[PDB]
Design an enzyme around this catalytic site. Structure first.
Site, PDB file in Angstrom:
ATOM      1  N   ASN A   1       9.995  -3.455   4.501  1.00  0.00           N
ATOM      2  CA  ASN A   1       8.726  -3.487   3.804  1.00  0.00           C
ATOM      3  C   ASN A   1       8.812  -2.181   3.043  1.00  0.00           C
ATOM      4  O   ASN A   1       8.629  -1.099   3.612  1.00  0.00           O
ATOM      5  CB  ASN A   1       7.560  -3.459   4.799  1.00  0.00           C
ATOM      6  CG  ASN A   1       6.187  -3.474   4.121  1.00  0.00           C
ATOM      7  OD1 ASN A   1       5.156  -3.511   4.800  1.00  0.00           O
ATOM      8  ND2 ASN A   1       6.166  -3.449   2.791  1.00  0.00           N
ATOM      9  N   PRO A   2       9.212  -2.250   1.773  1.00  0.00           N
ATOM     10  CA  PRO A   2       9.331  -1.045   0.957  1.00  0.00           C
ATOM     11  C   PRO A   2       7.982  -0.414   0.627  1.00  0.00           C
ATOM     12  O   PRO A   2       6.949  -1.081   0.645  1.00  0.00           O
ATOM     13  CB  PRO A   2      10.040  -1.563  -0.297  1.00  0.00           C
ATOM     14  CG  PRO A   2       9.505  -2.929  -0.430  1.00  0.00           C
ATOM     15  CD  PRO A   2       9.571  -3.445   0.994  1.00  0.00           C
TER      16      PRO A   2
ATOM     17  N   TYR B   1       4.906   0.944  -1.330  1.00  0.00           N
ATOM     18  CA  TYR B   1       4.271   0.467  -2.549  1.00  0.00           C
ATOM     19  C   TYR B   1       3.644   1.687  -3.195  1.00  0.00           C
ATOM     20  O   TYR B   1       2.836   2.356  -2.558  1.00  0.00           O
ATOM     21  CB  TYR B   1       3.145  -0.518  -2.210  1.00  0.00           C
ATOM     22  CG  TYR B   1       3.515  -1.675  -1.296  1.00  0.00           C
ATOM     23  CD1 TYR B   1       4.848  -2.067  -1.109  1.00  0.00           C
ATOM     24  CD2 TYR B   1       2.517  -2.401  -0.642  1.00  0.00           C
ATOM     25  CE1 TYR B   1       5.174  -3.157  -0.292  1.00  0.00           C
ATOM     26  CE2 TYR B   1       2.831  -3.493   0.170  1.00  0.00           C
ATOM     27  CZ  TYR B   1       4.156  -3.862   0.339  1.00  0.00           C
ATOM     28  OH  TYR B   1       4.448  -4.943   1.134  1.00  0.00           O
TER      29      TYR B   1
ATOM     30  N   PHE C   1      -2.267  -8.179   4.600  1.00  0.00           N
ATOM     31  CA  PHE C   1      -2.350  -6.852   5.182  1.00  0.00           C
ATOM     32  C   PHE C   1      -3.804  -6.488   5.419  1.00  0.00           C
ATOM     33  O   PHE C   1      -4.705  -7.123   4.862  1.00  0.00           O
ATOM     34  CB  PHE C   1      -1.704  -5.841   4.256  1.00  0.00           C
ATOM     35  CG  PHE C   1      -0.248  -6.037   4.105  1.00  0.00           C
ATOM     36  CD1 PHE C   1       0.616  -5.675   5.126  1.00  0.00           C
ATOM     37  CD2 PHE C   1       0.271  -6.606   2.950  1.00  0.00           C
ATOM     38  CE1 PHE C   1       1.993  -5.876   5.002  1.00  0.00           C
ATOM     39  CE2 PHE C   1       1.645  -6.812   2.812  1.00  0.00           C
ATOM     40  CZ  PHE C   1       2.507  -6.447   3.841  1.00  0.00           C
TER      41      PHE C   1
HETATM   42  C1  LIG Z   1       6.488   1.086   3.846  1.00  0.00           C
HETATM   43  S1  LIG Z   1       6.978   2.229   5.061  1.00  0.00           S
HETATM   44  C2  LIG Z   1       7.767   1.143   6.279  1.00  0.00           C
HETATM   45  C3  LIG Z   1       7.518   1.605   7.723  1.00  0.00           C
HETATM   46  C4  LIG Z   1       7.943   0.603   8.809  1.00  0.00           C
HETATM   47  N1  LIG Z   1       9.325   0.179   8.602  1.00  0.00           N
HETATM   48  C5  LIG Z   1       6.968  -0.593   8.849  1.00  0.00           C
HETATM   49  O1  LIG Z   1       7.400  -1.723   8.518  1.00  0.00           O
HETATM   50  O2  LIG Z   1       5.784  -0.391   9.210  1.00  0.00           O
HETATM   51  C6  LIG Z   1       8.260   3.260   4.345  1.00  0.00           C
HETATM   52  C7  LIG Z   1       8.739   4.347   5.299  1.00  0.00           C
HETATM   53  O3  LIG Z   1       9.988   4.897   4.857  1.00  0.00           O
HETATM   54  C8  LIG Z   1       9.848   6.286   4.530  1.00  0.00           C
HETATM   55  N2  LIG Z   1      10.062   6.492   3.070  1.00  0.00           N
HETATM   56  C9  LIG Z   1       9.150   6.674   2.080  1.00  0.00           C
HETATM   57  N3  LIG Z   1       9.607   6.850   0.883  1.00  0.00           N
HETATM   58  C10 LIG Z   1      10.995   6.780   1.076  1.00  0.00           C
HETATM   59  C11 LIG Z   1      12.092   6.970   0.205  1.00  0.00           C
HETATM   60  N4  LIG Z   1      11.948   7.206  -1.104  1.00  0.00           N
HETATM   61  N5  LIG Z   1      13.334   6.922   0.744  1.00  0.00           N
HETATM   62  C12 LIG Z   1      13.468   6.695   2.052  1.00  0.00           C
HETATM   63  N6  LIG Z   1      12.528   6.503   2.975  1.00  0.00           N
HETATM   64  C13 LIG Z   1      11.290   6.556   2.409  1.00  0.00           C
HETATM   65  C14 LIG Z   1       8.455   6.729   4.967  1.00  0.00           C
HETATM   66  O4  LIG Z   1       8.550   7.636   6.079  1.00  0.00           O
HETATM   67  C15 LIG Z   1       7.729   5.467   5.385  1.00  0.00           C
HETATM   68  O5  LIG Z   1       7.245   5.579   6.729  1.00  0.00           O
END
Ligand SMILES: C[S@@+](CC[C@H](N)C(=O)[O-])C[C@H]1O[C@@H](n2cnc3c(N)ncnc32)[C@H](O)[C@@H]1O
Length: 385
Positions: A85-86, A88, A168
């Site tokens: 889940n990238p 947003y 969500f």
């Molecule tokens: C949308 S959350 C997904 C969290 C978890 N996997 C979930 O499904 O609830 C993206 C997570 O990846 C990390 N993140 C944010 N921006 C990122 C980036 N540019 N590169 C790598 N990791 C990133 C953040 O710590 C964040 O908690």
């Protein structure tokens, strides 16, 4: 965030990887998808997770954790399956990093969005035949800034889009699950039904020759309505109002009423079929005849269609020609003759609302230019000959 369980389960059921394959979850944190996949498919895989925040990375001993910016990390190995889940959002340092992103990602257009970048990076880390399953907003289906992402996906593999909607906790984001297989093919559009056991997919339509055009929920009635009328965009020039600042930097513009002054109208003055010239909602007034200096069409009575009222067609004819701070302004093209009163009635009709609601559902919060340009006008309201 906080991907609801039934959503993670649905995604995990669409996932697949060969025994021994590398499973990756970008922006993993504690690894919700790594865990769920293992619980559902087994332990015979190489689990990898990438997190940038050292305080979020909380993975089990069987998973290989990696501290890095997924968007800029260059691993030495391709993957079989990518789940996630990238994030947003836009630009998150910020502008500095943004430029590296802008140069690193070919599908980056406009302000774009971080999820589009994650999608491109994900596809590039996939080995031939690989599969990615992501949950993302539905905006990329219709928005202009995602035109390049759409072409990319269309040419790199086969794409399946499952409409989930506003699943969500925060209710103004419509979600879509995209299942992409890096084995070229077309596009499959699926709908879903939410029940106590979660989601059930229902194939809607397939586009084997998809090359990146906007994705819509078409039916025989929408097709019919569109072939039997002409696109509103062939009969009209769609112009944009001057932004609030242009007005404030314009002399003759007052912030208090007076004789000879007219209110600068906003979307609140536009009603379905009529304009409320009385109530001022902008807190700006100016001599009517001076509006022509901001935009020439302000001096010409014309059709106004809303872009602020959501995904529906609200239209009216501005017979008085007042200055507007927003909305879409339609000027008929050279040689087009129309019946304003009936055109207006047609645009605000139930059939028009049903048509638009069928096609774009709640993908985006407002009616866009691309949706507007394609509205079909029955040939008995306006024509060009
Ligand atoms: C949308 S959350 C997904 C969290 C978890 N996997 C979930 O499904 O609830 C993206 C997570 O990846 C990390 N993140 C944010 N921006 C990122 C980036 N540019 N590169 C790598 N990791 C990133 C953040 O710590 C964040 O908690």
């Amino acid at each position: 965030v906080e991907t609801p369980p039934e959503v993670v389960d649905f995604m995990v059921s669409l996932a697949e990887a060969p025994r021994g394959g590398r499973v990756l979850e970008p922006a993993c944190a504690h690894g919700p998808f790594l865990r769920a996949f293992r619980e559902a498919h087994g332990t015979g895989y190489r689990f990898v997770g990438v997190e940038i925040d050292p305080k979020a990375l909380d993975l089990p001993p069987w998973a290989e954790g990696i501290l890095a910016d997924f968007l800029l990390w260059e691993p030495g190995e391709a993957f079989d399956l990518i789940l996630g889940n990238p994030p947003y959002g836009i630009v998150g340092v910020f502008k500095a990093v943004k430029d590296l992103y802008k140069k690193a990602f070919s599908t980056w257009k406009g302000k774009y969005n971080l999820y589009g970048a994650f999608l491109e990076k994900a596809v590039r880390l996939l080995k031939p035949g690989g599969v990615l399953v992501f949950v993302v907003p539905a905006t990329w289906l219709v928005l202009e800034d995602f035109a390049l992402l759409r072409e990319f996906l269309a040419r790199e593999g086969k794409t399946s889009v499952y409409y989930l909607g506003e699943v969500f906790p925060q209710k103004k984001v419509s979600a879509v699950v995209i299942r992409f297989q890096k084995s070229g093919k077309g596009l499959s559009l699926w709908d879903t039904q939410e029940s106590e056991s979660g989601f059930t997919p229902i194939l809607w339509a397939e586009y084997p020759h998809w090359e990146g055009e906007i994705i819509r929920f078409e039916t025989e009635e929408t097709r019919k309505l569109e072939i039997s009328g002409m696109p509103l965009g062939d009969l009209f020039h769609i112009r944009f109002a001057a932004r609030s600042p242009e007005f404030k930097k314009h002399p003759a513009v007052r912030k208090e009423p007076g004789p000879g002054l007219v209110p600068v109208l906003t979307g609140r003055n536009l009603k379905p079929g009529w304009v409320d010239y009385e109530k001022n909602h902008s807190g700006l007034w100016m001599p009517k005849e001076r509006a022509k200096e901001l935009r020439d069409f302000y001096a010409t009575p014309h059709l106004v269609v809303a872009h602020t009222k959501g995904t529906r067609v609200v239209a009216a004819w501005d017979e008085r020609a007042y200055p507007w701070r927003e909305e879409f302004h339609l000027l008929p093209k050279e040689g087009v003759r129309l019946d304003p009163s009936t055109l207006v009635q047609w645009l605000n009709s139930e059939a028009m609302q049903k048509h638009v609601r069928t096609l774009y559902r709640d993908f985006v919060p407002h009616l866009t230019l691309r949706m507007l340009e394609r509205l079909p006008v029955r040939r008995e309201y306006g024509f060009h000959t």
